[PDB]
Design a protein around this nucleic acid. Structure first.
Ligand SMILES: [K+]
Ligand SMILES: [K+]
Ligand SMILES: [Mg+2]
Ligand SMILES: [Mg+2]
Ligand SMILES: [Mg+2]
Ligand SMILES: [Mg+2]
Ligand SMILES: [Mg+2]
Ligand SMILES: [Mg+2]
Ligand SMILES: [Mg+2]
Ligand SMILES: [Mg+2]
Ligand SMILES: [Mg+2]
Ligand SMILES: [Mg+2]
Ligand SMILES: [Mg+2]
Ligand SMILES: [Mg+2]
Ligand SMILES: [Mg+2]
Ligand code: NA
Ligand code: NA
Lengths: 50, 122, 197, 116, 203
RNA sequence: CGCGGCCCGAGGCGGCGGGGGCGACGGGCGGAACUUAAGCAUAUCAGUACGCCCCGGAGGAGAAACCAACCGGGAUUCCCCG
RNA sequence: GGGUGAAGACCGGGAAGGGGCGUGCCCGCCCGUCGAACGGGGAGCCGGCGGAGACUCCGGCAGGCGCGGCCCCCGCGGAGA
């Protein structure tokens, strides 16, 4: 909604900042086999419950 | 790189305070440089050193202050709870060793007239 | 207007106190308890308190001075000439009972307001059976002040100096006149109607 | 007695007088002026702000309020401040719009700090 | 001999004098709270017999409890199982009223150590007891060899583990010999020892 | 009508304590039914599951208001035996 | 405050239950800064600007509520409304 508490707003803020891929220089520095971050979410499919 | 606490322990409180002020000011300057333009290697190199320099100066100041305050309450009955000896809760709430060895007077008298002796059989 | 004081709602403690006084006043109290409701007169009590004040034990400030002076002098030497044998009165129910049963006490004073009362409920009959004069008196505080304690259950005379003998004999005669045992043991108390008085 | 109600009497009340201090050493917090300010924001809209309205856009600590942002800006950059507007962004940072006093050229201060 | 006289006196509860005193006391207690601190013991001789001393660290509390049997806690008074478990109102508590008073006081004052208790009065809907408690951190208590043992951490909440005299009696520990061989060191311990399946290496 | 002692209470201050956590072992309470009886109601499962409270490195118990019946033993605990 | 229950907990007006001015006196039986982005509530309009914001930015013109200085007064008219 457009009328939220700051407490709910801060927990949703962290979810957005975390929805990122694995950086390219990290994949090769650590010699990673699996190159996708499976803790990502999509707004049309998820239920954050926050 | 950076300062050493060795030669830092040789300054007065005011000097350290001024040093800290300058370090924080130029840390803000480096943050501005990172936020704008681009991260050239030299300023980014200086950045980490400055952060750890602030850490070191704060360490020295706090150690000096703690030593002074601890010397202020050396012989008092009640001292701040931050200077009392480090123990656990359970061993803090416990009887000392002599309190455990106390006996009533009658038992003291009895246990003195029959002391332990060394002997062998055969 | 009119006075509002007799209409105040007092705190629970005060009300309990006053109701307890009333109840003790208008119930049927047995004669053994009743004897502690009928103390000795005030004049004789004053005479006895004067005589007893002449025989008081050590004073608290004198005690404090002694605790240093005589304590450190007993180390020097001459210990026997350090605790004078000044005649004093005795306090405490245990000691009083001990010397009443051996007939070393001439006069026994018992406070009228001991709580609980079983502590001294039997003492008058023991004294009577032992042939020892006794008197009930007004307050534990006064008996305590005699011996420099907050309060005490009773004191007793064990000896008196030759000079004070005549006054002691007068006091004894007055006490023997003013205290009767059989009448006290036959008389009930309480039973006062509210409307009557 | 003009009131029929019994009230608790008035007794002397004392003040606290601890035998030992509860916080022997005075410690700092987050609110130091230089650490309160984080960094300026650099975009074309913001340079247009500097040129047109005499305003600078800065990132600050979320716990800061308008009066202390004004004081910190005045002390760290020697200048005068007219008004401050604030904002908390969707990612959780605090943004301040600082408009300088009319007799102050915001552009020269911006350039001196290196923002220009 | 004063305390001998007091003891013999307290053996005659039905005399007129003691009857009058008991009536006064029972009226007095009925106007107070269910848990209350006392300035001093009401019965000095019994308190001395149970271990009380007149020094800093000993305290006395008066406790009130209700009389009669117990009623089960089940909605609408319905038990649902087999017919032998169907009773509601005719039951009796497994512990005595003297042992319940110590539990109530221990719950109310968790920072003190319970010692003992004794009877002081009853009136037909209540009984009153007195409980002796010790402050384990007072220096006079901690430096006295005669009471030091209660400063140990194993003396914490003795009444909650059935270790006082009344709890011990409810556990069956006032008996020895024939009739008492299946209840030491505790009922469950004896049951466990008598039903263990020992499987040795060379069976 | 005022003020001293004792007694019973009230408000504040100082210094020390308490509270909560821990799928085992330990102590104290409350307390089933499935199941077996070839049905089932006493009995059994079981003084178990589970609920509540409380310690410790162990806990609990413990120096006879005991066994026994003998040419007797002798605080408590744990193992073997029936 | 308390009451009850083995507890967990649940129930509750009969209880010495606060302030002011300013240091002494005076007044006074007894909870809640819990519960409504629709109920009550002191006060905002116009024009313009961006790529994504506007009763919030800028320009103009106003309102309400406080604080600080300087001057600065303790009521008259009508037959009556
Ligand atoms: K069973
Ligand atoms: K609202
Ligand atoms: Mg800090
Ligand atoms: Mg034991
Ligand atoms: Mg306190
Ligand atoms: Mg089964
Ligand atoms: Mg069957
Ligand atoms: Mg079958
Ligand atoms: Mg069937
Ligand atoms: Mg069985
Ligand atoms: Mg043990
Ligand atoms: Mg509200
Ligand atoms: Mg509205
Ligand atoms: Mg406006
Ligand atoms: Mg829009
Ligand atoms: Na607990
Ligand atoms: Na432990």
């Amino acid at each position: 909604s457009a009328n939220k508490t700051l407490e709910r707003k801060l927990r949703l803020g962290k979810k957005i900042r975390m929805n990122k891929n694995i950086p390219r220089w990290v994949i090769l520095k650590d010699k990673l086999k699996k190159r996708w971050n499976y803790k990502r979410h999509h707004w049309r499919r998820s239920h954050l419950k926050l | 790189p950076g300062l050493k606490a060795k030669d830092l322990i040789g300054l007065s409180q005011e000097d350290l305070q001024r040093k800290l002020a300058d370090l924080k000011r130029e840390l803000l300057s480096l943050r501005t440089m990172k936020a704008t333009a681009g991260p050239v290697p030299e300023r980014i190199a200086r950045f980490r050193v400055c952060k750890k320099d602030v850490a070191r100066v704060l360490t020295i100041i706090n150690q000096k202050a703690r030593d002074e305050a601890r010397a202020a309450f050396e012989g008092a009955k009640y001292i701040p709870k931050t200077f009392r000896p480090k123990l656990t809760h359970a061993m803090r709430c416990q009887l000392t060793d002599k309190q455990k060895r106390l006996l009533p007077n009658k038992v003291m008298k009895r246990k003195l007239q029959f002391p332990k002796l060394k002997y062998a059989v055969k | 207007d009119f006075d509002l004081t007799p209409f105040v709602r007092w705190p629970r403690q005060v009300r309990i106190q006053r109701q307890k006084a009333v109840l003790q006043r208008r119930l049927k109290v047995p004669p053994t308890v009743n004897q502690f409701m009928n103390p000795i007169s005030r004049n004789l009590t004053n005479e006895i308190f004067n005589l007893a004040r002449k025989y008081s034990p050590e004073s608290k400030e004198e005690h404090k001075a002694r605790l240093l002076q005589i304590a450190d002098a007993k180390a020097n030497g001459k210990p026997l000439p350090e605790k004078s044998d000044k005649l004093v009165i005795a306090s405490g129910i245990r000691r009083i009972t001990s010397l009443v049963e051996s007939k070393r006490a001439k006069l026994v004073l018992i406070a009228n307001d001991v709580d609980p009362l079983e502590l001294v409920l039997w003492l008058p009959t023991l004294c009577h059976k032992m042939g020892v004069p006794y008197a009930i008196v007004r307050t534990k505080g006064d008996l305590g002040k005699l011996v420099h304690l907050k309060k005490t259950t009773s004191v007793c005379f064990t000896d008196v100096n030759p000079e004070d003998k005549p006054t002691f004999d007068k006091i004894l005669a007055a006490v023997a006149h003013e205290v009767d045992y059989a009448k006290a043991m036959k008389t009930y108390g309480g039973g006062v109607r509210r409307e009557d008085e | 007695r003009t009131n029929v109600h019994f009230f608790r009497p008035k007794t002397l009340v004392h003040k606290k007088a601890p035998l030992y201090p509860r916080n022997p050493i005075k410690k700092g917090s987050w609110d130091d002026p230089c650490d309160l300010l984080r960094y300026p924001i650099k975009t074309d809209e913001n340079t247009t702000q500097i040129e047109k309205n005499n305003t600078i856009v800065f990132i600050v600590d979320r716990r800061a309020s308008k009066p202390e942002i004004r004081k910190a800006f005045e002390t760290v950059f020697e200048t005068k401040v007219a008004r401050v507007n604030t904002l908390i962004t969707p990612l959780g940072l605090k943004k301040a719009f600082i408009r300088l006093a009319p007799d102050v050229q915001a552009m020269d201060v911006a350039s001196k700090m290196g923002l220009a | 001999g004063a305390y001998k006289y007091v003891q013999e006196l307290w053996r005659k509860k039905q005399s007129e004098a003691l009857h009058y005193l008991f009536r006064l006391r029972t009226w007095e207690y009925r106007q107070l709270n269910a848990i209350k601190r006392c300035s001093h013991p009401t019965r000095p001789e019994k308190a001395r017999r149970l271990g009380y001393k007149a020094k800093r660290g000993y305290v006395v509390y008066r406790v009130r409890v209700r009389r009669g049997g117990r009623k089960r806690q089940c909605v609408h008074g319905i038990s649902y199982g087999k017919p032998r478990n169907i009773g509601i109102v005719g039951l009796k508590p497994s512990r005595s009223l003297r042992a319940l008073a110590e539990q109530k006081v221990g719950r109310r004052l968790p920072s003190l150590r319970v010692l003992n208790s004794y009877w002081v009065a009853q009136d037909g809907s209540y009984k009153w007891y007195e409980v002796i408690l010790i402050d384990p951190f007072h220096p006079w208590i901690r430096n006295d060899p005669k009471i030091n043992w209660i400063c140990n951490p194993v003396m914490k909440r003795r009444e909650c583990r059935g270790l006082t005299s009344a709890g011990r009696k409810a556990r069956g520990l006032h008996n020895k010999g024939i009739g008492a061989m299946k209840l030491r060191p505790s009922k469950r311990a004896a049951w466990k020892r008598n039903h263990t399946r020992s499987l040795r290496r060379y069976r």
